[PDB]
C-alpha cells in the first residue's frame, strides 16, 4: 500500500447526516424542477 | 586491478550473450 | 585517486547488465532443461 | 492490563521487523535489487504499529556494530521504563554482530525512526535525523540503497513541508535528481520529479513546473503511485494553463491509476479538478461519482456548481460561490471555477449543437438567453474555432448547420487502435514470460 | 565600508537625476534614457539581483526596484516592447522573490496589471493565467488596477468583443493605452481568424461591420495581408474544404511491417 | 530564487558588462533552472560563436552546463572543450566528473575506430579532448596509479603514454610482468 498521507482526506467538523440517503440511481434530469405535465398539458390543450 | 576488473567484466558479458543466443537456438531445436 | 571514478562508473554499469543477463540466462537454462 | 497485549504485539513487530532485514539481506547477496521492494511494501503499517520499545530494541539489536549511528540515534529514543524482563533482542549473532551492517540496513532502520519523530509532533530531530540519513545516502552508492533513498527522499521533503521550509529543500531535490538521472534509477527519478512538482505548486511557481515537465523525461517503469502523483501533477499545470483537454485526459488516467481502496483524500483533490475542468470545457460530470459515500459531503459544493451550470443561471452560480467561496480557495479551484463563472455559455451552445442539426441565430440567442444574434453569433464562432462544437455558419441564410458524422469504421482508425492494443497486450506477454523465475538451481 | 557608502551615494544622486528628469510635468525621454543606460552598469555593484535571500542592504533593494520601475514605464512611454519586456523580467523577480523582507511598493499593482495586459495584447494567455494565479486572491477582485486586464479576458474568453471595443475608453491610468490598441488589433486578427475556421463564403453582414473598421476601405490592407481571394465585394470565400482529403492509398508497406512484427513477436523465444 | 528570467533577459542588451554579469549569476543558478536556462540557451550559444567578446569561455562554459543538465552530452562535450582552461579537470564536482567520463569515452571510440585505418584516411581528433586526456593521464602519473594510466593508455593505444607510464615508475620490472600478463591474456585485437 501506498497511503497518501500527502492529500488530507476532507475534514469531518460538519460531517451533516444524510438529507434522504435514497439508493435507487440519482440521474440528471431529477434535479430539473417541471410543472406538472399533466398540468402542462391542460395548458398545451387549452392555448391548441 | 581495476582495469583487469573491468576488463574481466567486458569478457563476463560477451560470454554471456553467447551464450544467451546459443541457449535460445537449443530450445528452437530442442522443439523439433 | 586518478581516474578512479571513472573506472568504478563503467564498473558498475558492466556490474548491472551482467546480473541482469545472468538472471535472464539462468531463465532460459531452465526451460531448456524442462 | 493492556501492557501485556503491547508487548506481545511489540515482540511481534520486532519479529517482522528482523524479517525485512533479512529480505534485504537476501536482494544484496542476491543481486536482486528488486527483493527490498517486498520489505518496504509494509512501511505504512509498520509505521502505524511502531512504538518506544520497538525502536529501542531494535536499534539495539541490529547496531552493533558502528556504534557512532546508535549514539545519535538512541538519545533521541526515550528509555524502557525501568524494564524487568528484557530479553536483550540479538538479532546479529557472533560474526554477524561483529561484522558491519549493511548500508540498506542502516538506512532502513534511520528510516523508521524519522518516521515515528515524524508521527509525533516533533519536527526538528525529525529534520536532524533525516539531514544525517540524507548525507550517508549521499556518501552511499549502491542500487538496494537507492531503492530506499526514494522513500527516504519522500518523507525527508515531507518533514520540510511540515517544518513550512519547502524551498530550501528545492535545491536538494535538484541535485539528488540529476545524479539519480545519471545514475539511471528510475525509481528514484520518479519520487524525486514528484516531490518537486509539489514543491512548485506549493508557490504556485507554475511556469517552473511546466519546464521541468517539458524538459524531463518521466520514467516509465515507475510505479503505479508515483504515475498517479505525476498525471495528477501534469493535469494540474494544464488546467491552470489552457490545455483542458489533456488536463482531462491526465487526471481521468490520474484517478484510474489510483489505488481502488486507499487514497481517500487523493480521489477526492482529483475528483474536484476533474470536476471543474469538465465544466470549463462544457461537458457534463457523471453523477455516480456525487454519490459515493467517500466523496460524498466532499463534492456538494462542486454538485451544486454543476446543477447551476447545466440549468445556467448566473443569479444561482453567484449564490453558490458566495457561499463556498472560501471551500474553493482553500481546496485550489477558485480561479478556474471564476473563468467557469464567465464561460458557462460554452455548456449551453454545446447541447444546442448536440441536440438541433439546424438552427437560427435568433433562436441560438433566445435559448441561449443572450442579446441581439449577434453576440450569438460572435459566441457560434468562437466555439467553432475552438473546436467545441463540429458546425459551420451561413448568415447569407442566418443559420448555423452541424456537420456530418463520418463513418470511422471504414477509416484506418480501428486499425490503429487495435494495433496498439495488440503491441500491448504482446508486451504484457513477453514481460510476464520474463518474469519468471526457477529456483531450484540455487 | 567607506567605498560602498560612497558608491551606494553615486547611485542614489543618479536615481535622483532621474526623478528630476522623469516626475516633471513632461519627461525629456531622451534624457532619461542616458540616464538608465548609465545606472543599469552603475547597479551592477550594489547586488543587482540577489542570488540568495541573505538579507541584504534595504537601501540597496529599494533602489533597484525604483529605477527598475521607471525603466518599465519608460519603456511603455516609448512604445518599446522588448524594453518593457526587458524591464519587467527583473521587475517582477524583484517585486515577488525578495519581498519577503523588502516592503510593498505603491506602483506593484499598477505595473503588475501593465504586463498582464501586455501579455493578454501579445496573445499569451497561457502566461497570462500563469502570472495572474501569483497574485493574492483579494487583489484579483480588488485594485481597479489588475481589474482591467481581467475584465477583458473573461470578455475575450465570453466572445463578447463588443464589450471590451465600448470598454477601450475606461483605462484606470494613462499608461493601458499604448497596450489598448495592440489588444484590439489582435482581437481583430483573433476576429479574423474564428471567421476563417467557422463559416462559409464570408457574409458575417459584411466583413467590416463585425470587424469593427470606421471605413469601408479600411480592411482591405488587412485582406491582402492575409490570403483572402477578395470575390465579390465584401465577399471572400475561406476555403473551409481544406482540399477535402479524399485520396486514400492502402499504406501497405508499413501494415505489412505491422504484421511481420507481429509474427515475429509471436514466434520469437522470449 | 525563483523566476530566473531577469538574468536571461539580460542577456541581449549590447553591453558586455551586463552581460558577463548576467552569465555570472546564470552560472551560480544553473542547478536550480536549467529548465528556465535552456529554453533561451542558444543566447549563450550565439554569444560564444561571436569572437568579439571576451567571456567567451564562460559562456561555453555555462551553456555546456545546462546541456548537460538537459541530456545532450555530446553537445555539452563540445562546449566543455570549447570552454578552455576555465573546466578544472582537478575540481571534485558532479558535471566535471561526468564530462570528463564522457571526454574519455569519446576519444577512446575515435582513437579505436583510427587504428584499423591508414595512415592517409585518418579521421582528425579535437585537440582539446586531446588535451583533456592527456591531463588525465597526467593526474594519475602524480597520483602514482600507473596501472590506471598503463590500462587507458592501452585502451585508447597511446603507445607513446603507455611506454612512458612503464618506464617512470617504481617497480619497473613489476610493470613489465603486468603488461605481458595483460597482452597475453584478455587483449584480443593481434
Given at each position: 500500500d501506498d497511503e497518501f498521507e500527502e492529500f488530507p482526506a476532507?475534514?469531518?467538523?460538519?460531517?451533516?447526516?444524510?438529507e434522504d440517503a435514497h439508493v435507487w440511481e440519482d440521474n440528471w434530469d431529477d434535479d430539473n424542477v417541471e410543472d406538472d405535465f399533466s398540468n402542462q398539458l391542460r395548458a398545451e390543450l387549452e392555448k391548441h | 586491478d581495476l582495469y583487469s576488473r573491468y576488463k574481466k567484466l567486458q569478457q563476463e558479458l560477451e560470454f554471456l550473450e553467447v551464450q544467451e543466443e546459443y541457449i535460445k537456438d537449443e530450445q528452437k531445436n530442442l522443439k523439433k | 585517486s586518478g581516474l578512479r571514478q571513472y573506472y568504478l562508473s563503467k564498473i558498475e554499469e558492466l556490474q548491472l547488465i551482467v546480473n541482469d543477463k545472468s538472471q535472464n540466462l539462468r531463465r532460459l537454462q531452465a526451460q531448456r532443461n524442462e | 492490563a493492556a501492557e501485556h497485549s503491547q508487548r506481545e504485539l511489540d515482540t511481534v513487530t520486532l519479529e517482522d521487523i528482523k524479517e525485512h532485514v533479512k529480505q534485504l539481506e537476501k536482494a544484496v547477496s542476491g543481486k536482486e535489487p528488486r527483493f527490498v521492494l517486498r520489505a518496504l511494501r509494509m512501511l505504512p503499517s509498520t509505521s502505524r504499529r511502531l512504538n518506544h520499545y520497538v525502536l529501542y530494541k531494535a536499534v539495539q539489536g541490529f547496531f552493533t556494530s558502528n556504534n557512532a549511528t546508535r549514539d545519535f540515534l538512541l538519545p533521541f529514543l526515550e528509555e524502557p521504563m525501568?524494564?524487568?524482563?528484557?530479553?536483550?533482542?540479538?538479532?546479529?549473532?557472533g560474526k554477524a554482530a561483529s561484522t558491519p551492517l549493511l548500508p540498506e540496513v542502516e538506512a532502513y532502520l534511520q528510516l523508521l525512526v524519522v518516521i515515528f519523530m515524524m508521527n509525533s509532533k516533533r519536527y526538528k530531530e525529525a529534520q536532524k535525523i533525516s539531514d544525517d540519513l540524507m548525507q550517508k545516502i549521499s556518501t552511499q552508492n549502491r542500487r538496494a540503497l537507492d531503492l530506499v533513498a526514494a522513500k527516504c527522499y519522500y518523507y525527508h521533503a515531507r518533514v520540510y513541508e511540515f517544518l513550512d521550509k519547502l524551498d530550501v529543500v528545492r535545491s536538494f531535490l535538484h541535485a539528488r535528481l540529476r545524479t539519480a538521472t545519471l545514475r539511471h534509477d528510475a525509481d528514484g527519478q520518479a519520487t524525486l520529479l514528484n516531490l518537486l512538482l509539489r514543491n512548485y505548486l506549493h508557490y504556485s511557481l507554475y511556469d517552473q513546473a511546466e519546464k521541468l515537465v517539458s524538459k524531463s523525461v518521466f520514467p516509465e517503469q515507475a510505479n503505479n503511485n508515483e504515475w498517479a502523483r505525476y498525471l495528477y501533477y501534469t493535469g494540474r499545470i494544464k488546467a491552470i494553463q489552457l490545455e483542458y483537454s489533456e488536463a482531462r485526459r491526465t487526471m481521468t488516467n490520474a484517478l484510474r491509476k489510483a489505488?481502488?481502496?486507499?487514497?481517500v483524500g487523493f480521489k477526492q483533490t482529483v475528483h474536484k479538478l476533474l470536476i471543474v475542468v469538465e465544466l470549463l470545457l462544457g461537458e457534463i460530470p457523471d453523477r455516480l461519482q456525487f454519490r459515493q459515500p467517500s466523496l460524498k459531503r466532499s463534492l456538494m459544493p462542486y454538485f451544486l456548481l454543476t446543477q447551476a451550470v447545466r440549468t445556467g443561471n448566473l443569479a444561482k452560480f453567484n449564490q453558490v460561490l458566495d457561499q463556498f467561496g472560501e471551500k474553493f480557495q482553500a481546496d485550489g479551484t477558485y480561479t478556474l471555477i471564476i473563468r467557469l463563472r464567465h464561460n458557462v455559455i460554452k455548456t449551453g451552445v454545446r447541447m444546442i449543437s448536440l441536440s438541433y442539426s439546424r438552427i437560427s441565430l435568433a433562436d441560438i440567442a433566445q435559448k441561449l438567453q443572450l442579446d441581439s444574434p449577434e453576440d450569438a453569433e460572435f459566441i457560434v464562432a468562437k466555439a467553432i474555432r475552438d473546436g467545441v462544437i463540429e458546425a459551420s455558419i451561413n448568415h447569407e441564410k442566418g443559420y448555423v448547420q452541424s456537420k456530418e458524422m463520418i463513418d470511422i469504421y471504414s477509416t484506418r482508425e480501428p486499425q490503429l487502435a487495435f494495433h496498439q492494443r495488440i503491441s500491448f497486450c504482446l508486451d504484457i506477454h513477453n514481460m510476464s514470460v520474463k518474469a519468471m523465475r526457477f529456483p531450484p538451481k540455487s | 565600508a567607506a567605498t560602498s557608502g560612497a558608491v551606494l551615494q553615486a547611485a542614489t544622486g543618479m536615481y535622483e537625476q532621474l526623478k528630476g528628469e522623469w516626475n516633471r510635468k513632461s519627461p525629456n525621454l531622451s534624457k532619461c534614457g542616458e540616464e538608465l543606460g548609465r545606472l543599469k552598469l552603475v547597479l551592477l555593484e550594489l547586488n543587482f539581483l540577489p542570488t540568495t535571500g541573505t538579507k541584504l542592504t534595504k537601501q540597496q533593494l529599494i533602489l533597484a526596484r525604483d529605477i527598475l520601475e521607471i525603466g518599465a514605464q519608460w519603456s511603455i512611454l516609448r512604445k518599446d516592447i522588448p524594453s518593457f519586456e526587458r524591464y519587467m523580467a527583473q521587475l517582477k523577480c524583484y517585486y515577488f522573490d525578495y519581498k519577503e523582507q523588502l516592503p510593498e511598493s505603491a506602483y506593484m499593482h499598477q505595473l503588475l496589471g501593465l504586463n498582464l495586459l501586455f501579455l493578454l495584447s501579445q496573445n499569451r494567455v497561457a502566461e497570462f493565467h500563469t502570472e495572474l494565479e501569483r497574485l493574492p486572491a483579494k487583489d484579483i477582485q480588488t485594485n481597479v488596477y489588475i481589474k482591467h486586464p481581467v475584465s477583458l479576458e473573461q470578455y475575450l474568453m465570453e466572445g463578447s468583443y463588443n464589450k471590451v471595443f465600448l470598454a477601450k475608453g475606461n483605462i484606470p491610468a494613462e499608461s493601458y493605452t499604448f497596450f489598448i490598441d495592440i489588444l484590439l488589433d489582435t482581437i481583430r486578427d483573433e476576429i479574423a481568424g474564428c471567421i476563417e475556421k467557422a463559416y462559409e463564403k464570408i457574409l458575417f453582414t459584411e466583413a467590416t461591420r463585425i470587424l469593427f473598421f470606421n471605413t469601408p476601405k479600411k480592411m482591405t490592407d488587412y485582406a491582402k495581408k492575409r490570403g483572402w481571394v477578395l470575390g465579390p465585394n465584401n465577399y471572400y470565400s475561406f476555403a473551409s474544404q481544406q482540399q477535402k482529403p479524399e485520396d486514400t492509398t492502402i499504406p501497405s508497406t508499413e501494415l505489412a511491417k505491422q504484421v511481420i512484427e507481429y509474427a515475429r513477436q509471436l514466434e520469437m523465444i522470449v | 530564487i525563483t523566476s530566473a528570467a531577469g538574468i536571461i533577459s539580460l542577456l541581449d542588451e549590447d553591453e558586455p558588462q551586463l552581460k558577463e554579469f548576467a552569465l555570472h549569476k546564470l552560472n551560480a543558478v544553473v542547478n536550480d533552472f536549467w529548465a528556465e536556462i535552456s529554453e533561451s540557451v542558444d543566447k549563450i550559444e550565439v554569444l560564444y560563436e561571436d569572437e568579439g567578446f571576451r567571456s567567451r569561455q564562460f559562456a561555453a562554459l555555462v551553456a555546456s552546463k545546462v546541456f548537460y543538465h538537459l541530456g545532450a552530452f555530446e553537445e555539452s562535450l563540445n562546449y566543455a572543450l570549447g570552454?578552455?582552461?576555465?573546466?578544472?579537470?582537478?575540481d571534485n564536482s558532479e558535471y566535471v566528473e561526468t564530462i570528463i567520463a564522457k571526454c574519455i569515452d569519446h576519444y577512446t571510440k575515435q582513437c579505436v575506430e583510427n587504428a584499423d585505418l591508414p595512415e592517409g584516411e585518418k579521421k582528425p581528433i579535437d585537440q582539446r579532448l586531446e588535451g583533456i586526456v592527456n591531463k588525465m593521464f597526467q593526474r594519475c602519473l602524480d597520483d602514482h596509479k600507473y596501472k590506471q594510466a598503463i590500462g587507458i593508455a592501452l585502451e585508447t593505444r597511446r603507445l607513446d603514454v603507455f611506454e612512458k607510464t612503464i618506464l617512470e615508475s617504481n617497480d619497473v620490472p613489476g610493470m613489465l610482468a603486468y603488461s605481458l600478463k595483460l597482452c597475453m591474456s584478455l587483449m584480443q585485437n593481434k
Open positions: 476532507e475534514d469531518w467538523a460538519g460531517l451533516d447526516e444524510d | - | - | 525501568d524494564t524487568e524482563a528484557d530479553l536483550q533482542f540479538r538479532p546479529r549473532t489505488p481502488q481502496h486507499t487514497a | - | 570552454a578552455g582552461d576555465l573546466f578544472n579537470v582537478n
